[PDB]
Design a protein around this ligand. Structure first.
Ligand SMILES: [Ca+2]
Ligand SMILES: [Ca+2]
Ligand SMILES: [Ca+2]
Ligand SMILES: [Ca+2]
Ligand SMILES: [Ca+2]
Ligand SMILES: [Ca+2]
Ligand SMILES: [Ca+2]
Ligand SMILES: [Ca+2]
Lengths: 173, 173
């Protein structure tokens, strides 16, 4: 079973402290892309990985527990399929014209202004986004959507955030 | 006279397009740390540099203009001296105990809870923070305080934000 299969994966990846650190995450993500010649990437760097862990570390242990890793891992597998699916010219990267359809397929309906800002921060000079950049951006987008949703208690579409909360959300990510 | 030297620096750095890109920033930053012995870094990576440019890119051109680069360059020169001043055990890195004093010298007064989060995200090893992690952290902290202050006209210590604004603030960084 996939549940039995996942505990085994996590158990082996987590190791001695029973949690997945940024380094352990980096190593497994780099092993995976190595098996996919259709995914162009300069590799998952340690900083990108420290960022992914921080943003997914709900309980501030500094590392990823079973549930935190299960959530991240399931998303990455779903997003990896979308990436292959929307790279219609097989450039191994998500071009600017390919980006909106890929994000929308992922469940994020943004606007032209936001898509342009995403491209300015996450794509290269040619306007192309490689695999590690794509996954890194989606992990953060999903987390920022979840953070806003949880702060929007009244369902008014506006949130109030104090300086302490602001610093915690932006610095630990 | 010190501004005639800087104009020459920016021009030769900015090149054909008259703006410093994340790539251009990475090169200059890695040349500098080489001609600086006990500063310890694993080098300035492209993701870290893409992040520093995004946070400093006020006019959304995607790159650093003269004034945007000037502000950044001066802070780095100011923060590098603090890094050296506070690395009392001359380990070439900023440890847990050395951190609060260095940030206080930069003008930041944060609580211990915020410091523990910063150490998990930027040090997390033996609690030591190398040079690129230190500068990266401060560039972001400075930008996040400046961002918050812009929306909180006449200090209430709280900002009100909708989803578009929230995504612009948290994703374009
Ligand atoms: Ca572990
Ligand atoms: Ca955790
Ligand atoms: Ca493509
Ligand atoms: Ca990349
Ligand atoms: Ca340039
Ligand atoms: Ca600019
Ligand atoms: Ca030290
Ligand atoms: Ca580093």
């Amino acid at each position: 079973e996939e549940v039995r299969q996942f505990r085994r994966l996590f158990a082996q990846l987590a190791g001695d402290d029973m949690e997945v650190s940024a380094t352990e995450l980096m190593n497994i993500l780099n092993k995976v892309v190595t098996r996919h010649p259709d995914l162009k990437t300069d590799g998952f760097g340690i900083d990108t990985c420290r960022s992914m862990v921080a943003v997914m570390d709900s309980d501030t242990t500094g590392k990823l527990g079973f549930e935190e890793f299960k959530y991240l891992w399931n998303n990455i597998k779903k997003w990896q399929a979308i990436y292959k699916q929307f790279d219609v010219d097989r450039s191994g990267t998500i071009g600017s014209s390919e980006l909106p359809g890929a994000f929308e397929a992922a469940g994020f309906h943004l606007n032209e202004h936001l898509y342009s800002m995403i491209i300015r921060r996450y794509s290269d000079e040619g306007g192309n986004m490689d695999f590690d950049n794509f996954i890194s951006c989606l992990v953060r987008l999903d987390a920022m959507f979840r953070a806003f949703k949880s702060l929007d208690k009244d369902g008014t579409g506006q949130i109030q955030v104090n300086i302490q909360e602001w610093l915690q959300l932006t610095m630990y990510s």
